[PDB]
Structures are given as C-alpha cells and as structure tokens.
Symmetry: D2
C-alpha cells in the first residue's frame, strides 16, 4: 500500500474537531495507507542516512481515544513513500534542521509535503516579497526611524514579527497611538531583530480569508475569519469567528497568480491569507481550516490532497 509518515506536534494534545493533520490521516486510512507517526525527536541522521523511530498509527473519530499505536520500529525514512511535514511554527532553527533530515530521505525518493528546500526558501511572511503587486505596502526593517516614517506616510499600520502565526504579536498603530516607540523597541528588540510593517487594511472587518491551494489549484470555498469583540486579530487562534464562503472573483485572481509558483516549488498544500483583495501571508508549514470548510460545503480537500500525492508518486 502507500506508507505515509507524518511529523507533527503531539497527537495526544490535538483537538480532533479542528485539527487538519488529523482529518488528513482519517482520509489516508480510509484509502488503505499504512500510517507512520513521528514527532521531531524521533528523526535523526547517522552518517547522512535519515532514519526515524516511527510508531504505526491507527486513527478514529472518537473523542475518548482517537489514535492508537499498533507497533513501532526504527526504519530509514526512504522506506516511506510520502512524509507530511505538519510541525507547527515557529520557524526556528530546529525546524530548519529537520528539513535537512527530511531532505536526505527526499534524495532517496520519498515525497515530502511540503518540499524541504521550499520550506526554507518560503518564509510565511517574507515570501510575500515575491508578489508585491498583490500585497499591502510592506516594509521589513530593524530601524525604528523607518517604522516611524512608514507610520507618518500611512497613518494606520500593522506591525508584526516574522516567525509566528495565529496572531502572535500583531500591533495596530493608528493615528495618535502613544506607543510607536515602545512597540518598535519591543518587536525589533532594540533594533537587533527585523520586523514587518504593513498598511492596515479596513476590509479585515469582512474577514481574513484562508484560501487553500492543493498543488497549484485553489480549493473553491474559503473560510473568512472575523476578529471578535476587542480583537485586532482575525485568526481562529486569537478567537476569530470562521465563516465558509465561495471564493469571490478577486480570490480567484490572487490564488491563480500564486498557484503555479507553489506547484513549481513543491508546495503542494498551501494556505493563503487574503484580506479584501490583498495577500497578507503564505502558510506553507501547517495550514488548517479544512474541517470548517468541509462541514459547510460538498468538497473533500483531504481527498484533493491525497489525489495530488498519488499523482506525484506516479
């Protein structure tokens, strides 16, 4: 059968109602694949051979017991046909070291979703620099002076870190905010770290849309994430409310401009974030929102993904 491996954060701590790695494993099992579970500490390199202690996994939609390990073994990763790299951000050096280990298996012919070299090339915030015609005004800098000047030009800005996801450290500096100085000292760590500033997009009130792309093809329904109450963050992670919608026509236009690059670079499962008609980030590590969209519409995103994996393995 196909043997699929998954590197992910502890399965014992996921919420199977929302988790997309889990929805993918139910579909792989429904198709008859042998599932091999791994966490970051299980992978290693011995004389350049990527190997791992895996546990053969069995999953089921049961809220008392959703997984069971039916055996364990140490194998070379080149023994698996597909490895899904579903480790959550932050993008740190540990994450990078794991992609070199996954890359030694990929040279022995294992398919890696997503491709290790592209995970290091395409940072979720800075890859927008390759599509500046679709993004808001974006400045990446360490200097408070440049941040102050971008604020004076735009009046209302969003300042963010480059490594997190889920609304980690998002500040909005509107007109008359008394805190530009301390927010820049906090995000650049007194000018020793880069941060990103973007002009604020009022359309966030209509939702931050997560648009999913399966091997360059946009899935036709998205999830708009509406910030809630006293929150500047649309992220479900920061309490945002999700609303499944068909793609609007500027959603198709952005997703098709990016689609071919993602295919070309082996970024087989990608989550675009679109606010209004601007692209704000590209999630290539562990994008979610599969469950919410799939509940509301007749589309099997996990099926699309396994179909694309199986074509890639032919």
């Amino acid at each position: 059968m196909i043997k699929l491996g998954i590197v992910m954060d502890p399965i014992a701590n996921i919420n199977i109602k929302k988790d997309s790695s889990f929805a993918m494993l139910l579909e792989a099992q429904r198709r008859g694949y042998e599932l091999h579970y791994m966490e970051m500490g299980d992978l290693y390199l011995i004389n350049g051979e990527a190997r791992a202690h895996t546990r053969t996994l069995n999953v089921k939609q049961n809220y008392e017991e959703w997984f069971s390990f039916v055996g364990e073994q140490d194998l070379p990763l080149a023994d698996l046909d597909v490895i899904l790299m579903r480790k959550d951000p932050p993008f740190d050096t540990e994450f990078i070291y794991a992609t070199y280990i996954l890359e030694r298996a990929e040279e022995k012919g294992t398919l890696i979703v997503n491709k290790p070299q592209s995970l290091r090339d395409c940072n979720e915030k800075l890859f927008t620099a390759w599509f500046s015609d679709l993004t808001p005004e974006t400045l990446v800098t360490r200097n408070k002076a440049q941040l102050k000047a971008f604020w004076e030009k735009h009046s209302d800005i969003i300042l963010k870190p480059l490594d997190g996801m889920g609304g980690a450290s998002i500040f909005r500096v509107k007109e008359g905010d008394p805190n530009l100085g301390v927010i820049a000292e906090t995000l650049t760590e007194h000018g020793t770290r880069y941060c990103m500033a973007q002009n604020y997009l009022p359309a966030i009130k209509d939702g931050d849309k997560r648009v999913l792309v399966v091997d360059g093809e946009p899935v036709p329904y998205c999830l708009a994430r509406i910030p809630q109450g006293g929150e500047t963050r649309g992220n479900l992670a920061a309490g945002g409310r999700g609303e499944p919608r068909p793609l609007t026509e500027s959603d198709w236009k952005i997703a098709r401009q990016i689609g071919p690059t993602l295919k070309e670079k082996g970024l087989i499962f990608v989550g675009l974030d679109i606010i209004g008609d601007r692209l704000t980030e590209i999630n290539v590590t562990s994008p979610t929102c599969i469950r919410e969209i799939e509940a509301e519409f007749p589309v099997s995103i996990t099926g699309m993904l396994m179909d694309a994996i199986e074509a890639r393995l032919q």
Copy 2:
C-alpha cells in the same frame, strides 16, 4: 568601476591583523572598486525591493584608524555588482531573514558571495551529511539514549551544537567520563534540540587544518590549528596555534571531491576543516585564516577571490 558591498559585523571592532573581511577590502580597493559598507540593520525590504543605507568606505592598514566613511546613501542593492556576505555565525533566523533580502538583489542581477539559497541549504555542520564518505561517524539526534549507545560503540566521542563556530560548546566524552547524561541534557536542552556526536579523531594533535576553496579550486597551502595546553579545541578562537603548511595529498583528495559542489552551488569562498583525513565541517558564512597563510607563502587568496568574482561578473 565595480561597486562591491559588504555586510559584516562592526568594522570598528575588528582586529585588522587577523581579520579576513578586511584583507579582502584592501585588495578590492587596491583594484579600484568602490566599497559600500553595511551592517545587518542597514538592509531592508520595501515592497519586495531590497535596499540599504550604505556608507562609502575607504580602508587602510593603520592600527589607529583603519577605515573611514566618505559619504552615505540609501540605494537599492541591485545597484551594487557584488555583495560579500561576511556576517559571523551563529546561524540563527536573523541570518536567514537577511539571505532573503540579499536574494531579492540577486534576482535583479547582483552577485552574492556566498549565494543566499546555498547559505540556507548548507549549514556548516549538517552539510557534511552530503559527504559521509569523507567525514567521521556522525549522529545528529535529540535522544540521550542514542548518544549513550554511540558512546558505548565508539568509546571516545566529540559532542557539539549545530549553530556555532570557533569551538563553541565542544565536549569530548572519553571512556569513564562521569558526565554523558548532563552533557546530553545540556546540548539537547532536555531533548528538545538536536546536537551532533562524532567519533573523536586522535589526529587533532597534528592540527585541525583550515583548507580554503576559491570557486571550487583548493588554495595550495592551509593553516593547521593545534589545540593549546588544556584545550580540546584547535580553533584559533579557542586559543589554537596556527601553522601554515602545504596541502598533503589527502588534503587534495578531499578538497577536490567537494570543490565542484561548492562551485555548482555558488559557494565561491569556503573554508573546509580537515582533521587527519576526515572532513569535520564546511564553513560557508565568514571563514578566516587568509592572513596567516598569506604571511607565510607566496599566494594571494584575496586576489584569487577577486579574480573569481570578476569572472563571475563577465
């Protein structure tokens, strides 16, 4: 003329007797290039255009005053013909973010020494995994159990981090050492970070040889670094004593097996570390030892480097 830029750690704090970035700038000036100085905080991205505040530099071998800035300007980095990325390790995410900024200039046709994509692909310790036939026995793992077992098989091991240089955190765990447990808990941070173990190479007593490669071509004399007194580290940084030597015949054999890969990947200036006949690491960020070799032998390594840059620009 050629306009060469350099991104480096503060020039006001270098030792011009030992520093190789400085020796390279004296040669570029001797050839008539216009030098533009940058530090990491000067580079930025505004709508995907890489730009920087540079300072036009003038250097001279004077220990009271070795540099002067004769002007400053904000320019797009694509205005320079060559940028030397000479920032010192650690390999951290800031270093990675800078390579995406240098990569936007490289797409507009600037030559980057070394190539930004290869700086992210070739970590100084883990790139040895692509030449395991030339390295010692090497294990990269988070698990103390695997480290203990590698120690029982080899008796005498070297344990190290993956990010530093200069002898940062090198432990030797010889037979009967009472500390394997606490050294593994310290380097893997209780199993949450990968570390590297290698079998100890007795030949370190004859020196850790720094072998320099200029665009795939090995420079014919090396510097052997001899550990001093009560030191397990050969590194000049950890007090090692340097001895310039001709390359021996296994030095030629290793350097030629790696030479073509480095050329192919745009790793134009590389420092190999060889102990005996084993490759232990590949320094691609800011390798030094140019001064010491050049003092003792009739070879101009900086000249070789500018000749290779000028060929690359043709």
Copy 3:
C-alpha cells in the same frame, strides 16, 4: 476551622505517590482544615492588598481522581490563617515577586510556611556560606581562572548552577577531564553568571541523605539517595534510589547546628542535603521525600508540620 492555602505547581500534574505537598494536604484535611488551592497566576496585588482567586479543595488518595474543587472565590489572602508556599524551583525573579505578595498577607497576620523574607535571603546553594564549617570547600565565581585553580588544588570537583534543584547541570571534573574550559564557559555563560564549585565527596556512594527539619527539630529518619548506574546525581529526580535510614550521629550534629537558625528565620519546613558528614545544600522552597520515609518508619512528618503550624498560630 483553620483555613490553609497552598501555592503550588499544577495539582493535575503531580504524582500522588511521591508528592509531599499532597501528603501535607491529606493531613490538613484529616484535621478538618478548609483548603484553598492557588497557582502563581491566581495571586495579585491591588493597591498593596494581596488577594487571590482560590478554589476550595478536597483531596483524596485516588489515582483516577485525587482532587476536586468545591467552589471558588476571590478573597484577600489575610483571610487565610496559613499559606504553604510549595512552588518548585527555579529560583527566578517570578518566585521573588510572589514572595512580596505573600509578604503583604503576612503583615496582615497570615502565617507563611516558609517565611517570604527568608526565602529571598536563603538561596538553597548560597545559604551554605553561613555554615562553611559544615560544608565542603566551596567557591562561587564567574572566572574560569579561579575554577581552574580550584580544580588543580582539589583534583576532583563538582561544578553546579545556583538556581536549580534535582541534579540540574551537575558536572564532575575529575583528574584528566578534557572539558574544564567548555564546562566553565557553559555554567558561567562566558563569565557573565556565577556558578558554584565544590570538592567532590566520595561518600556520595553511600547516598545523598535528605534530612528533614520541622521548626528547628530534625525528623529522626532520613532518606539516602544513591546515584544509579551511569549517574553522578543522587537526586531521585535524576533517577537516584532512596533508602530510609535512622539519622547517624554526624547527621544529628549537623541538623542541630542548623536547627535554631531555621527556626529563628521562620523556615519551618526545611530539607538538608548531607553527603557523608558535609552539608551540600539547604532546600527551603519545596523539599520532598516525606512519603518514602513515612512508608518505612513510624513517624508522621506531616503531623509534625501541622503541630508546628498550630503552635505558630497560638
């Protein structure tokens, strides 16, 4: 009744077989006290009044369910008669900030076990400086030069941090160890942090004895902790094997020399560590070993503690 509060690490994550805070709560409940549970985040200060969100607790020796909250409330801490500060190390600034909050309640007449001012005065490693006649040779320094010289004088030394417990970072540097330099650079963080060196005590082979002192009175049986296998640490936390013993006559002599100071300073429940006839540290924050001693001998340490609390409240 007496209302006793406890500040501790999450009760949902303790092992009731070994945990001493839990054994103390079963005894307080057996005596009829009302138990109020708190974690560090529940305590606060509003205009200098110490207050907390507590949860009224019910505990029982049941491995499926060992606690239940039967209500919650926000109260001033001065409403409780006794607060047991049982938060585990590290000794960090958060720990110190909590002692000022517990100190505002103590001025309104609540008994704090142990006394907040003494928790800040008596660091578990450096308080041994007030009894240097009972300790091994001890040097606290940031300088590798002094560490090297102490090693040359003593041949076999133990190097440790000042903040942890449980065998955190204990190195033994015996004769001919190739790592003094990197161990000193690691514990002093290149000379910016103090560490402690002590001469190694061969008697650790007979056990690191935990001697418990209840209001200056030594409990008459101790637990010797024997290091296991390839371990330099006797700590149960680092796999040490515990053996309950009567106190030997040098155990009585040390415990009585320290007894009156601990009483005097309101350090009502203290865990001395004795190796042979030398005192190595004084645990005043959350000392354990009550269960193991009590299983083997006819002594109720928790009873001694509640008797001392009740006398203190008279």
Copy 4:
C-alpha cells in the same frame, strides 16, 4: 584613610557628564579616600568569605582619560570600610547573588550602600505597595482578564514590567486602543509573568520628578523629566528633558513620609520618582540625576552622601 569600594558597570563605558557613580568617586577622592574599583565578575565567595580582585582607582574630570588603575590586589571585602553597590538594573538573579556576597562582607563590618537585604526586599516597582496611600491605583497581575477590567474602570492606563528602569517597556492604553490583548500577552508572556498596571497620571506633562533622599533626608531640589516629542516616557534614558526645580510642598510631604523607612532599612541613597502628587517608583539600585541638579543649584549631594557614610561609620 577610608577605603571605599564600588561595584559598577564598566567605567570605561560611562559618560562622565551625566554619570552619578563618577560624581560620587570625584568627591570621595577629593576627601582623601582610597578607591577600589570592582565589576560583578571580580567578587567571589571562598568558604563563605567574600573576597574580590580590586583595582585601586584614580578618577579625574578629563574626557580623554577619566580613570586610571594604580595597582590591583585580591583582598577580603571586609578590608574596605564602605562598598557602594552601583550596578544598574535589571533586577535579575545575578544581582541577587551579588547581594549575598556583599552581605558576607557586611557581617564582618563593612558598610554597604545600599543595604543588601533591603535591595532584595525593596524592588523599585513593588516596594510602592508599602505606600499605597501615596501611589496611583496599582494592580500587579498575570491575568489579562484583570488587566482588561482595570482598563475599563480607569480608561487610561500605564502597563509596565517589574524589572527594568529608564522607560523599559512602558505602554499607555488609552480609550479605544486596539492593542490591550497583545500588550498583555507581551508583558505577562502569555500569563506566565506578572506585570504592573497603574492609572495614567496627566501631570506627567509637567515632568516625572526625580527626588533624591540621602539617609532619610530629602535633597531640596529635584529634576523634573519632561517626555519629548512622540514619547510617553519622561526618563532621560528615553530622551526626556530635565529641569531642576525646588521641591514643591507635596514633594516634601511624600519624601518625608518615606524618608524614615529608607533610613531604617539602610537605603542611604534613594531616588523617588513623583508625577504630580503620586509616587510611581522607588529607585534603590543606581539612581542618577545628581549632575543636573548640582549644576543648577548650590547643593552638593555627593557631599551629603559622604557625610552620611562617615556618620554611619562612627
């Protein structure tokens, strides 16, 4: 003569125009004291005896060369009559460990300015809890829920950390600020660290007054620090503009209510911060502003301090 020691941050890096430790050393030298210079790494403990490598210091108001060491020696600290602890914040555990070392010298009869036990008892922000009748409304908490509620009650609040000085991390959350959530997640590190909230005091527009107290006696002129431009921080450190003034009558009233406690606790040199008629913090580690006040008025604060030291030594 009197031998005075000073523990301070590197003298080679101070600005003698503004630095108050330096102004104190010129006065001690003018009186004929022998000055012994120390940095944190020079102090150590060997079997509970506090000792240090000192350098005999000579200072002079010369901007090319303001200090010279005329010898060095290792001595027990009990050999000095007075040690000025002038190390700058942060208040971290290293700072605390140094106070135990200074405390072993103090038991052998050395005067420590300020007293080590009081430096650990009187944190610069939380010691205000002992004078809540003179401070603004102050909440110290880890819970965002309590911070949100304090903001709804007061409309305009100041949120700050407990460890820094100089305007480190001061946020103002006025009505309609879109960032309460991310500022609380940032200062409490997702609820794992305490932070302080206070209601905003409009009077900061007239200056944050530094009021100096020499052994319980208020010095009669203060320095008001006016925030500048786009700054919420009055601190000279964050660009604030200083204006020497006589004490107003509510400045006398606050300083006299605190004066006797500071004397009583051996906090011989203290810098109160007063905004309007509210006390906001008490700087006991390294308060400055001596130069600016002394330039404008006929008062020798350093003289007052040496007079108080000499009385303390009688």
